[PDB]
Write a protein that binds this ligand. Structure first.
Ligand SMILES: O=C(O)CN1C(=O)c2ccccc2C1=O
Length: 167
């Protein structure tokens, strides 16, 4: 048993809810929240900007030190940093950004990072402002992630469409 509430069960391991991931993280305090990061860990908008704002910019301060030491992530890659006030850990995962011209085939590699964690609260990778088709992102998630993932879908209209169209 875990603390996640009100999710629709899609598969053995994938659950989904219409939720603000910031509000969900604040309520659940999961072991792992996933950030929709870029390779620079520059948390300006979407989930990253919202998560970072909720940490009072502490996520960005920690991230800048990480990049100064290690250099940028890879598209498809990840790093584990603090979850600050939102979670034990934040798994920063870089899905391909279609609005920057990145290979959508990298989305499966991005989701493979989730398999290193038994349970995660996460957004749909490459969805929202990263420009991918969220229906596709959900299909790759279901077909890639084997650990237990709780997906927060910000947009109520997209949530309804993802559930209704799910195979
Ligand atoms: O719902 C989310 O989680 C991510 N996401 C989208 O994929 C999307 C598409 C069109 C309008 C708003 C949004 C949005 O927020």
């Amino acid at each position: 048993v875990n603390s996640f509430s009100g999710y629709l069960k899609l598969t053995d391991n994938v659950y989904i809810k219409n939720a603000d991931i910031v509000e969900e993280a604040k309520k659940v305090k999961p072991t792992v929240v996933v950030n929709a990061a870029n390779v620079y860990l520059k948390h300006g908008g979407g989930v990253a900007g919202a998560l970072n704002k909720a940490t009072n910019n502490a996520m960005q301060v920690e991230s800048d030190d990480y990049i100064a030491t290690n250099g940028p992530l890879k598209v498809g890659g990840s790093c584990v940093l603090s979850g600050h006030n939102l979670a034990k850990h934040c798994l920063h995962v870089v899905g391909p950004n279609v609005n920057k011209g990145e290979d959508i085939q990298l989305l499966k590699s991005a989701y493979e990072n989730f398999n290193q964690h038994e349970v995660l609260l996460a957004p749909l990778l490459s969805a929202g402002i990263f420009g991918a088709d969220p229906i596709h992102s959900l299909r790759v998630c279901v077909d890639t992630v084997r650990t237990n993932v709780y997906l927060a879908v910000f947009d109520k209209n997209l949530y309804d469409k993802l559930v209704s169209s799910f195979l």
